[PDB]
Amino acid sequence: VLYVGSKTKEGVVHDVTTVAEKTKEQVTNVGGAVVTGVTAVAQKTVEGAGSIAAATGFVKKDQ
Amino acid sequence: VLYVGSKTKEGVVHDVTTVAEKTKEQVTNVGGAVVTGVTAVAQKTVEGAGSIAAATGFVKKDQ
Amino acid sequence: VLYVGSKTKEGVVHDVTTVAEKTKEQVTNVGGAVVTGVTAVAQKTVEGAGSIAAATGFVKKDQ
Amino acid sequence: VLYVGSKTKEGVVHDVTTVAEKTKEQVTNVGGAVVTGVTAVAQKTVEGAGSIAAATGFVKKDQ
Amino acid sequence: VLYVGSKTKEGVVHDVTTVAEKTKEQVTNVGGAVVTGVTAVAQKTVEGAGSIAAATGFVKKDQ
Amino acid sequence: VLYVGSKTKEGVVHDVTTVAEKTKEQVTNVGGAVVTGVTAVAQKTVEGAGSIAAATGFVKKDQ
């Protein structure tokens, strides 16, 4: 690897605008996962067997 | 690998605009996964057997 | 690895604007995970087997 | 550029919930008026002398 | 640029919840007016002499 | 730039909750007016001489 004057931009998130508006919201949850907001994940490298990069609303029940 | 004056842009997310508006919302959840918001994942490399990169509303029940 | 005058930007998050507005919100939760706010995760490297990078609303029940 | 117009809610009614359970009700009316249920009126304009907008359980015995 | 207009709620009614359970109610009315339930009126304008906007349980015996 | 307009709530009613449980109620009315339930009135303007905006449990016996 060798850069010379290069404007590299690996693995980013930007300029994310959300104008939300809810007059009413009701969330009932039992055991599970609920996600209703803004999420932003930015990773460059994730190495590993069995791993999980960037879960969101994840439900895992193994044996 | 060798860059010279190159404006590389690997694995990004940008300029994501969401104008949402909900007069009423009702989420009932039992055990499962619900996702109702904005999500933005940006990864460059994910190595590994059995892995999971960028799940969203994922339900895993193995044996 | 060798950089020379390069403006590298590995694994970042920026310029994330959220204008939210909720007249009413009701969250009932039993055992599970609920996420309703703004989240921003930025990692460069996550190594390891079985690991979890950047969970959000994660429910894990293994044996 | 992206434009989103101006909402307006001149004279509305919404989100009226009434639950009843194991409810005994006995009513005896003689010449009068009785109201026992849910009602919702939404008008924008009512004009005129002597008018009666949105009566409910009204009795009117003039001479 | 991104524009979001100006909301307005001139004369509304919302989010009215009434639960009842194991409720005995006996009513006897004679010539009068009785109101025992949920009501919701939303008007923007009412004009005129002698007008009666949004009566409820009203009795009117003039001479 | 991002603009968000000016909200306005001229004359509204919201979020009215009433729970009742194991409630005995006996009512006897004779010629009069009785009100025993939930009410919600939301007007923006009422004009005119002699007007009666938003009566409730009103009795009017003139000569």
UniProtKB/Swiss-Prot annotation, chains A, B, C, D, E, F:
<feature type="repeat" description="3; approximate">
    <location>
        <begin position="6"/>
        <end position="20"/>
    </location>
</feature>
<feature type="repeat" description="4">
    <location>
        <begin position="21"/>
        <end position="31"/>
    </location>
</feature>
<feature type="region of interest" description="4 X 11 AA tandem repeats of [EGS]-K-T-K-[EQ]-[GQ]-V-X(4)">
    <location>
        <begin position="1"/>
        <end position="31"/>
    </location>
</feature>
<feature type="binding site">
    <location>
        <position position="14"/>
    </location>
    <ligand>
        <name>Cu cation</name>
    </ligand>
</feature>
<feature type="modified residue" description="Phosphoserine">
    <location>
        <position position="51"/>
    </location>
</feature>
<protein>
    <recommendedName>
        <fullName>Alpha-synuclein</fullName>
    </recommendedName>
</protein>
<comment type="subunit">
    <text>Soluble monomer. Homotetramer. A dynamic intracellular population of tetramers and monomers coexists normally and the tetramer plays an essential role in maintaining homeostasis. Interacts with UCHL1. Interacts with phospholipase D and histones. Interacts (via N-terminus) with synphilin-1/SNCAIP; this interaction promotes formation of SNCA inclusions in the cytoplasm. Interacts with CALM1. Interacts with STXBP1; this interaction controls SNCA self-replicating aggregation. Interacts with SNARE components VAMP2 and SNAP25; these interactions allows SNARE complex assembly and integrity.</text>
</comment>
<comment type="function">
    <text>Neuronal protein that plays several roles in synaptic activity such as regulation of synaptic vesicle trafficking and subsequent neurotransmitter release. Participates as a monomer in synaptic vesicle exocytosis by enhancing vesicle priming, fusion and dilation of exocytotic fusion pores. Mechanistically, acts by increasing local Ca(2+) release from microdomains which is essential for the enhancement of ATP-induced exocytosis.</text>
</comment>
<comment type="similarity">
    <text>Belongs to the synuclein family.</text>
</comment>
